[PDB]
């Protein structure tokens, strides 16, 4: 009789299927693509999927196929995934922030007078980044990076110089996808790097603030569209989506700002933490709200499109590179747990995971219960091969580990600010009717509208009319931003490693997810020592800072206090928020491109840095409540479930 545990180095199903197989081998089925209407052939099964995959390559009628085919063989996929990884390491997609020489001297902006000899480490510490596992070069003053293979300086993982769309080293530094999407757990002596472990430590606001005070890349230029944060390990990255229609023609990606499609009063979505790329292969949808099909890469393209230096053709023309990025992400598997596991305890956990009804014996009466068996599995997915072969649990064994449930907010009840991001029909319609929704697949679509500002102004008006309930103007595409209803229950493969948890990174360990009463409202992880100069302590990421029992960061609880003399200053209310917490780069970028009053990024002070280094659940969007149906568990059930998660 099949195993309960399923520990695997190779998790990604295409990589499982291609392992040791020649290039010409027909690619394995992507199980995410099986999650379509009809999948739930047993309506009484423990798990009922509700977030369906949408195939944009061969779209439902009346849409037409206009995308190059996805890979059809193991060799095609592997070559694509290699190109994806090279793109992540060397291509400058994300908006450049600073000249290489300004970055070389950025200790000036930290308040140092001369370069400390630990400069390269202090960069990592200050900004919550890591020593990169690849050569990540930038040119020292005087060096021409196109004669010196990028330069002899090295950047941390998370920053990039890279190569522009003409294949040349740019001489400019910005963030990379890895600033948010990647991190090290364990020093490089303790652990190899694996892609797709979301960053718990990055401070996006502090990098933006520092960079803003360097020599402008463009002398008179506008503020840059770049993300901010209230602290570390989450950011307003997703705020970009709301910003997009303010700056860019939504059909052509021409930079042509307009008032007509920007809802300037959509509520701020809060901070979100990056989901884990290394389980992309199990997720039918993108984004914390499950809003888009995982077949789509236009969402993955946002930061490359939002770069102010590209023209409409170049922005749209990033698509091939992003399909290769996407294939690298689907090729990923999570790191395997590096410590000891009690196999028998993990098997008790496996059972609890798949079978224990959290609403059993009248528990959690006040939390609406979804269709299914009330177990972890009824939302997150079925992991156990034994349960995967049982139609009381899963209708198809190929669906093992698939996360395709968006849990309604009335049940999940975690911080709701993020689920309001595209709540307004007007916003979704702007998206639905253009390039973002792949409206080139409409049967009514001819060609891209003209790439010119006058014509872009012409089209804005009937677009806004459609957005507000009027006649169709631009055709609709199949890559619809779904109306939000809740949050995706994400894959727990790899979750051992990815603390802190929930979409806002508010809960520092798995125990806390499992026991709401033990979640600290404010919590501080172990820091590194300050560097030479006495500043830039960072978050320590060595194994000693991780909690191998409760599965998460070691932390010290801290009390909120509105007294101004306290340090770190950690208010009990979002109302006492300081200027660095309230700032929105996206808001001011929009204001400035729309010829409205705008506020430039505040210089973030060292006292504010002290507060950004502690997680505060009281800030807007930062609540640590929710997923409370785990309170019905016993502590014995919780330890078993933790041991089981170690095996995922």
Which residues are documented as binding site for heme c? 177, 180-181, 272, 280, 283, 287-288, 376, 379-380, 414, 418, 502-503, 627
- Can you spell out the DSSP letters for 227-247? ---SSSS-BSTTHHHHHHHHH
Q: 361 CB contacts (<8 Å, ≥6 apart)?
A: none
Residue 551 tokens, joined: 């599965």
Closer Cβ to ligand HEC, 59 or 162, answer by number = 162
Binding test (CB under 6 A) with ligand HEC, winner from 52, 127, 487, 639: 487
| Binding window for ligand HEC (CB under 6 A); candidates: 27-35, 337-345, 473-481, 624-632 | 624-632
Least distance (Å) between residue 304 CB and ligand HEC:
5
Q: Tokens representing 594?
A: 């729309």
Per CB under 6 A, the list member of 171, 245, 275, 334 interacting with ligand HEC is: 275
* Contacting residues for 30 by C-beta, under 8 A, at least 6 apart: 13, 14, 281, 330
Return the HEC string of 13-37.
HHHHHHCCCCCCCECCCCHHHHCCC
Closer by beta carbon to ligand HEC, 238 or else 351: 238
Q: In terms of C-beta density within 10 A (0-12 exposed, 13-18 middle, 19 or more buried), how is residue 361 classed?
A: exposed
Angle formed at CA 581 by CA 161 and CA 576, multiple of 5 degrees: 170
Pick the binder of ligand HEC from 107, 303, 436, 493 (CB under 6 A). Answer: 303
Q: Smallest distance, Å, CB 77 to ligand HEC?
A: 17
Give the residue with the Cβ less far from ligand HEC, 214 or 504: 504
Q: Does 513 bind ligand HEC (CB under 6 A)?
A: yes
**Residues 96, 261: Cα–Cα separation, whole Å:** 26
Regarding 227 and contact with ligand HEC (CB under 6 A), the answer is yes
Q: Which of residues 314-373 bind ligand HEC (CB under 6 A)?
A: 325, 329, 358, 370
Report the nearest approach of ligand HEC to the CB of residue 369 (Å). 7
Binders of ligand HEC among residues 236 to 265 (CB under 6 A) are 237-238
Among residues 34, 98, 106, 412, the one that binds ligand HEC under rule CB under 6 A: 412
List gaps in the chain by the residue before each (C–N > 2.5 Å).
none
Please give the Cα distance from 201 to 182 (Å, whole number): 10
177 binds ligand HEC (CB under 6 A): yes
Choice between 297 and 464, CB closer to ligand HEC: 297
**Residue list for the binding site:** 177, 180-181, 272, 280, 283, 287-288, 376, 379-380, 414, 418, 502-503, 627
User: Nearer to ligand HEC by C-beta: 378 or 474?
Assistant: 378
Interaction between residue 495 and ligand HEC (CB under 6 A)? yes
Q: CB of 117: closest distance to ligand HEC in angstroms?
A: 29
Is the Cβ of residue 330 or residue 464 nearer to ligand HEC in the bound state?
330
Quick one: 32 or 280, whose CB is closer to ligand HEC? 280
Residue 304 is a binding residue for ligand HEC (CB under 6 A): yes
Residues 6+ apart with CB under 8 A from 23: 73, 74, 75, 76, 78
> Which residue of 32, 70, 126, 283 would you call a contact of ligand HEC, by CB under 6 A?
283
Asked if 306 interacts with ligand HEC (CB under 6 A), we say no
> Tokens representing 106?
């950025």
The C-alpha atoms of residue 632 and residue 546 are separated, in whole angstroms, by 27
Non-local CB neighbours of 554 within 8 Å, separated by 6+ positions? 525, 526, 545, 546, 547
According to the binding rule CB under 6 A, does residue 207 interact with ligand HEC? no
117 CB burial (10 A radius; 0-12, 13-18, 19+):
exposed
Alpha-carbon distance 523 to 558, whole Å? 6
Q: Judged by CB under 6 A, does residue 224 bind ligand HEC?
A: no
Which of 138, 285, 130 has its CA nearest to residue 194? 130
Interface pick for ligand HEC out of 74, 376, 476, 590 (rule CB under 6 A): 376
- In 3D, which of 374, 377, 334 has the Cα closest to residue 358? 374
Using CA atoms, how far apart are residues 391 and 394, in angstroms rounded to an integer? 5
**Least distance from ligand HEC to the Cβ atom of residue 618, Å:** 17
Element (H, E) at 501: none
**Does a cis peptide bond (omega within 30 degrees of 0) precede residue 62?**
yes
Residue ranges in 538-557 that form contacts with ligand HEC under rule CB under 6 A: none
Structure tokens at 503: 């979409």
Shortest Cβ 202–ligand HEC spacing (Å): 7
Counting contacts by CB under 6 A, is residue 502 touching ligand HEC? Answer: yes
Task: Quote the CA–CA distance of 155 and 595 in Å, as a whole number.
Answer: 36
Residue placing its CB nearer to ligand HEC in the complex, 205 or 531: 205
We find the least distance from the C-beta atom of residue 575 to ligand HEC, in angstroms, to be: 24
Q: CA nearest 499: which of 479, 517, 520, 480? A: 520
Q: With contact defined as beta carbons under 8 Å apart, do 284 and 53 qualify?
A: yes
Return the residue of 35, 250, 489, 609 that touches ligand HEC, per CB under 6 A: 489
Q: Of residues 415-474, which lie at the interface with ligand HEC (CB under 6 A)?
A: 418
If one asks whether residue 409 binds ligand HEC (CB under 6 A), the answer comes out as no
Closest CA to 503 of 518, 484, 517: 484
Of the pair 325, 430, the CB lying nearest ligand HEC is at: 325
Give least dist CB 182 to ligand HEC, A: 10
Give the sign of the dihedral formed by CA 297, CA 298, CA 299, CA 302: positive
Among 80, 411, 509, 632, binds ligand HEC (CB under 6 A): 411
Q: How far is the CB of 446 from ligand HEC (least distance, A)?
A: 30
* Residue among 107 and 487 whose Cβ is closer to ligand HEC: 487
- Residue 492: closest CA among 327, 274, 334: 334
In 3D space, the residue among 455, 439, 437 whose CA is nearest the CA of residue 447 turns out to be 439
In the complex, minimum distance from the CB of residue 358 to ligand HEC, in angstroms, rounded to a whole number: 5
Q: Shortest gap between Cβ of 262 and ligand HEC (angstroms)?
A: 19
19-27, 212-220, 409-417, 520-528 -> range binding ligand HEC (CB under 6 A)? 409-417
Q: Shortest Cβ distance from residue 307 to ligand HEC (Å)?
A: 10
* Length of the chain as a residue count: 648
Which are the contacts of 217, defined by CB distance < 8 A and separation ≥ 6? 96, 97, 98, 99, 172
- Nearest residue to 128 via CA among 194, 189, 197, 180: 180
- Examine residue 129 and tell whether it contacts ligand HEC (CB under 6 A): no
Q: Residue 490: enclosing H or E segment and its boundaries? A: none
Question: Is residue 283 a contact partner of residue 488, using CB atoms and an 8 Å limit?
Answer: yes
The least distance separating ligand HEC from the CB of residue 272, rounded to whole angstroms, comes to 3
Size of the site for ligand HEC (CB under 6 A): 52
- Contacts with ligand HEC, residue ranges (CB under 6 A): 93-94, 175, 177, 179-181, 204, 227, 235, 237-238, 272-275, 280, 283, 286-288, 300, 303-304, 325, 329, 358, 370, 376, 378-380, 407, 411-412, 414, 418, 487, 489-490, 492, 495, 498, 501-503, 510, 513, 627, 629-630, 641
């Amino acid at each position: 009789a099949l195993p309960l545990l399923d520990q695997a180095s190779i998790r990604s199903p295409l990589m499982v299927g291609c392992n040791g197989k020649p290039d010409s081998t027909p690619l394995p089925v992507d199980p995410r693509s099986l999650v379509k209407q009809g999948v739930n052939s047993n309506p009484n099964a423990a798990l009922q999927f509700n977030a369906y995959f949408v195939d944009l390559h061969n779209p439902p009628p009346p849409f037409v196929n206009r995308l190059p085919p996805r890979p059809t063989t193991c060799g095609q996929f592997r070559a694509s995934a290699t190109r994806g990884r090279v793109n992540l390491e060397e291509r400058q997609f994300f908006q450049p922030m600073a000249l290489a020489t300004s970055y070389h001297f950025i200790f000036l902006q930290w308040g140092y007078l001369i370069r400390p000899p630990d400069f390269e480490e202090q960069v990592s510490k200050r900004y919550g980044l890591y020593p990169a596992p690849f050569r990540n070069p930038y040119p020292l003053p005087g060096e021409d990076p196109n004669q010196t293979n990028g330069g002899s300086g090295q950047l941390p993982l998370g920053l990039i110089q890279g190569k522009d769309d003409n294949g040349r080293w740019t001489g400019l530094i910005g963030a990379s996808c890895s600033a948010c999407h990647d991190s090290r757990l364990g020093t490089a002596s303790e652990a190899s790097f694996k892609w797709g472990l979301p960053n718990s430590a990055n401070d996006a606001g502090l990098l933006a603030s520092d960079m803003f005070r360097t020599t402008p890349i463009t002398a008179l230029g506008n503020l840059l569209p770049l993300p901010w944060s209230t602290g570390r390990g989450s950011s307003d990255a997703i705020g970009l989506i709301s910003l997009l229609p303010a700056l860019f023609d939504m059909e052509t990606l021409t930079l042509a700002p307009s008032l007509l499609e920007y809802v300037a009063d959509a509520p701020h979505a809060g901070m979100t933490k990056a989901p884990a790329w290394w389980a992309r292969a199990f997720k039918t949808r993108q984004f914390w709200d499950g809003s888009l099909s995982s077949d789509n890469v236009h969402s993955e393209m946002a930061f490359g499109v939002a770069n102010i230096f590209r023209d409409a053709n170049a922005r749209r023309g990033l698509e091939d590179e992003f399909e290769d990025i996407n294939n690298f992400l689907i090729s990923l598997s999570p790191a395997t747990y590096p410590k000891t596991i009690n196999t028998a305890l993990a098997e008790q956990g496996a059972v609890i995971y798949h079978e224990r009804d959290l609403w059993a014996s009248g528990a959690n009466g006040a939390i609406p219960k979804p269709a299914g068996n009330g177990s972890c599995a009824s939302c997150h997915g079925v992991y156990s091969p034994r349960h995967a072969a049982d139609p009381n649990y899963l209708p198809d064994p190929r669906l093992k580990g698939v996360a395709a449930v968006v849990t309604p907010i009335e049940t999940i009840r975690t911080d709701p600010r993020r689920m309001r991001l595209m709540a307004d029909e007007r916003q979704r319609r702007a998206w639905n009717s253009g390039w973002w929704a792949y409206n080139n697949l409409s049967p009514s679509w001819t060609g891209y509208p003209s790439d010119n500002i006058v014509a872009s102004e012409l089209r804005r008006v009937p677009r806004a009319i459609y957005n507000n309930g009027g006649p169709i103007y631009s055709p609709l595409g199949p890559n619809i931003w779904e109306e939000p209803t809740g949050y995706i229950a994400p894959p727990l493969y790899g979750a051992w490693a990815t603390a802190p948890y929930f979409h806002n990174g508010s809960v520092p360990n798995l125990w806390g997810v499992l026991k709401p009463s033990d979640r600290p409202k404010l919590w501080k992880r172990p820091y590194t020592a300050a560097g030479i100069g006495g500043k830039n302590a960072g978050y320590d990421y060595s194994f000693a800072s991780y909690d191998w029992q409760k599965l998460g960061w070691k932390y010290t609880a801290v009390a909120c206090n509105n007294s101004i003399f306290t340090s770190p200053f950690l208010p009990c209310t979002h109302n006492m928020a300081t200027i660095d917490i309230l700032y929105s780069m996206w808001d001011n970028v929009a204001a400035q491109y729309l010829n409205l009053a705008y506020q430039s990024p505040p210089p973030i002070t060292d006292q504010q840095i002290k507060s950004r280094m502690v997680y505060n659940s009281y800030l807007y969007g930062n609540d640590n409540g929710g997923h409370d149906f785990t309170q019905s568990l016993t502590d014995s059930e919780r330890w078993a479930l933790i041991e089981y998660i170690k095996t995922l």
